[PDB]
Amino acid sequence: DSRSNAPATLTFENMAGVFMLVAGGIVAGIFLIFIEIAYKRHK
Amino acid sequence: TGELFFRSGFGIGMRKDSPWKQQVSLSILKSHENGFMEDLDKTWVRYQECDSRSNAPATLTFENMAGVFMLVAGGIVAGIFLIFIEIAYKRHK
Amino acid sequence: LLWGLVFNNSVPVQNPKGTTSKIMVSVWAFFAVIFLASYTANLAAFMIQEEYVDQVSGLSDKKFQRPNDFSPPFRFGTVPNGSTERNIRNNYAEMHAYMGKFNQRGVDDALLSLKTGKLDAFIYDAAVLNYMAGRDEGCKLVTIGSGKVFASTGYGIAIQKDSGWKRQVDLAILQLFGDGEMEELEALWLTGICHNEKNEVMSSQLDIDNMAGVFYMLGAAMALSLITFICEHLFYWQ
Amino acid sequence: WVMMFVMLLIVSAVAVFVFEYSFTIGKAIWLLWGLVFNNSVPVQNPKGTTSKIMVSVWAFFAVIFLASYTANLAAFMIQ
Amino acid sequence: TLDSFMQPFQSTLWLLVGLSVHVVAVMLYLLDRFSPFLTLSSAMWFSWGVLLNSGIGEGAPRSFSARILGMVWAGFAMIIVASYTANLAAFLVLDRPEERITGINDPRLRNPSDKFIYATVKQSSVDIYFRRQVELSTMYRHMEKHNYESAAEAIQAVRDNKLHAFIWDSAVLEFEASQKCDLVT
Amino acid sequence: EEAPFVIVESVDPLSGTCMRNTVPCQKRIISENKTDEEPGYIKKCCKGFCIDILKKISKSVKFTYDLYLVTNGKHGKKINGTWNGMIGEVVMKRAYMAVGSLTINEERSEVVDFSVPFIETGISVMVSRSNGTVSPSAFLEPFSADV
Amino acid sequence: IVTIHQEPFVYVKPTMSDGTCKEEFTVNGDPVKKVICTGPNDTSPGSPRHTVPQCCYGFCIDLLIKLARTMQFTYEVHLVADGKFGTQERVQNSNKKEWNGMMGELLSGQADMIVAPLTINNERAQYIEFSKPFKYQGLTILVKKEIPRS
Secondary structure, three states: OOOOOOOOOOOOOHHHHHHHHHHHHHHHHHHHHHHHHHHHHOO | OOOOOEEEEOOOOEEOHHHHHHHHHHHHHHHHHOOOHHHHHHHOOOOOOOOOOOOOOOOOOHHHHHHHHHHHHHHHHHHHHHHHHHHHHHHHH | OOOHHOOOOOOOOOOOOOOOOHHHHHHHHHHHHHHHHHHHHHHHOOOOOOOOOOOOOOOOHHHHHOOOOOOOOOOOOOOOOOOHHHHHHHOOOOHHHHHHOOOOOOOHHHHHHHHHOOOEEEEEEEHHHHHHOOOOOOOOOOOOOOOOOOEEEEOOEEEEOOHHEEEEEEEEHHHHHHOOOOHHHHHHHHHOHHOOOOOOOOOOOHHHHHHHHHHHHHHHHHOOOHHHHHHHHHHHHH | OHHHHHHHHHHHHHHHHHHOOOOOOOHHHHHHHHOOOOOOOOOOOOOOOHHHHHHHHHHHHHHHHHHHHHHHHHHHOOO | OOOOOOOOHHHHHHHHHHHHHHHHHHHHHHHHHHHOOOOOOHHHHHHHHHOOOOOOOOOOOOOOOHHHHHHHHHHHHHHHHHHHHHHHHHHOOOOOOOOOOOOOHHOOOHOOOEOOOEEEEEOHHHHHHHOOOOOOOHHHHHHHHOOEEHHHHHHHHHHOOOOOOEEOOHHHHHHHOOOOOOOOO | OOOEEEEEEEOOOOOOOOOOOOEEEEEEEOOOOOOOOOOOOOOEEEEOOHHHHHHHHHHHHOOOOOOOOOOOOOOOOOHOOOOOHHHHHOOOOOOOOOOOOOOOOHHHHHHHHEOOOOOOOOEEEEOOOOOOOOOOOHHHHOOOOOO | EEEEEEEEEEEEEEOOOOOOOOOOOOOOOOEEOOEEEEHHHHHHHHOOOOOOOEEEEEEEHHHHHHHHHHHHHOOOEEEEEEEEEOOOEOOOOOOOOEEEEEHHHHHHHOOOEEEEOOOOHHHHHHHOOOOOOOOOOEEOOOOOOOOOOO
């Protein structure tokens, strides 16, 4: 016995975008830390 | 608003037997096939002084939101009263 | 501070040192939160009610009369060797000379061309188009309404010349209209399913031309910023 | 929920440890938690630049998260 | 049934907003470096922090034109976020489709079509009821080429997404729906 | 033959005749070219929109009828100062009546008579629905001008 | 000719003190062709039973103008006597049965043709002759519009 359920819940694969974006941000951040220590050693 | 129903057209009346009957019955067809009727329609009927699609959303007025204004006015007057109580408490200590 | 407190609290501010001023700015922040909530609610309610934007006037529109003196040239045509083609040739010479390029080969071919975007419009008989529109797959096709129709006529029943039977069949057809059987026949055989199809809202995806308003607002704000900078420099130079 | 929780933990730890060499792990977790709930509680910002980029990306993620949550919650109450 | 980032906004719009904030940063910087009486790095940090709502960076414009431009940029970011949230909510609340054919007089079921299939049990009362009705002659002619052997195979084929509609009595269908919570009449 | 008005079909193979709620139309068939063929009538079953009106007329006023399809080309044409098809058949009538998707104009009405039309038609435009818009000045729309 | 008063088709306006009605022009500037109208008084033929000369103009007016131009004849119009389209008037009246209104005036012999927005029905066309339709109007409903608000 279950009434009609109109709303749909959000899954995990549908929102993998933010996770991919933050992973790319972390790897770009470690690359930017390399560029940053390089620029610091330059000056 | 609504759908058409019992769509019957107008017509010119006359007696039971007359050549003017057939004359008009041919002249009306000639006018319809020529374009005179379209000009008459666009001139005397097609005024078109108002063309506006349906607008479902409703805008918020000012009287409907007077609540926040009343609340902030009460807050200001309570604040001046609180400044009186505050200077009183400061003078107390 | 009192301006930043209304736009979500994005720009840094400098808080006072008192207590009554703190209560005042707290009340103002509550007001700003209520304001933002109501604004967001009304904005979300607004975007869910836009649809049904398409209309043409008739055979006297600028699109038909002046194809070149407008946006990239519009397209409209039909098949040749027909009553409609002969009528539009005897009525609008230039329109026929223009539309002769887009002469189609049939009715279903023209419908497929319109569905694929190769043709922009279609000019044919009202009854067959209404039938093929009301009894088609989906309800994406629709006419421009009855409105004004050039060379308005009907489908009669040919009878031999000077036949007395015509008087009887005329009264018979009139009684058919008076009784309502003709309406039932038109609703059974002619009226499709899309006639009772309401408008379906959708999502516009927020293209660039939509934010043109805020873009022009930012441009005018930058212009006013430059104007005020020049004015302040002129006023402070002396 | 547990995905974003463990992701917050991993991001905070990696950020502080790698790009922080007074900014300990407690304040970092507090900041990375406050940045997801509209920015209501006070925080203590770092002094670096890559940590700033990391917390900016995290704030963008939190904004997207809040927008989607609010959208789904508004869609839920109408049915 | 939506996409994460680029569903409510266009990528070209994202690029336009990025170029806009990049230009606004330099415009806020110049207004102080070219006026009488702005740490381009801190100016760009402020311009990025106002849009992304992040609480990073400690810098405020000390001029008047720069100040009003920052106020306008904050308002622009606010209205952009508001429009984004509104469009996302609209698209997430207007994306709940459910056919749920009403019944026998449904337009999809009243007229035969290749995008909707339905069957029944051959050599039964349903066949007689469809053959005796003249209004449903087209539906009968369409369903004649899809009749099944019995209900045991038909119910199994329905759940296999091979069919789209099935007709039987009330008691048998209700019991099959109740004793197997997979389909609902 | 007209797709929305007069639809032609074949007899029922299970009975070799026409089904119910149909009118037996004798489709004229002329295929032999070397020699004129005997009266050629193929048992067909015609039905549609005008057929119902014709049946109701025959039920109202008492008369008998037997339809037969046109021979060549189309319903009406005035080439070489002469009519063909249905109108050309009506010229040398031999039928005394004509039905179908026929249009009314000046020439065909001056030649043959016409009754009251039972359906309206005319030149009509046909286009496809376009996706909606947002009224791009909507960023300041959901609010009054005084607030 | 006989004509009834309907604003979208047949406008009626009182003539000036000179004896005619002041001419005017359309939006583009074309001269609106009018014609003299000899009908009843302003309110009704009841108390002021007088024939005051007015002037009429409208769709049917210019249609009749074009028809008389192409047919090359002359005319003398006059308004309706009672103010009704036409219907059967069944009174006990053993030796009496006829039409009333404009249809009754036509059957009586007041005029020959009817240039007016008259409908077409079975009983109407049963007695008199009609022509091809020059308009197609189907009945409809009308409701008031109210602007929404919070």
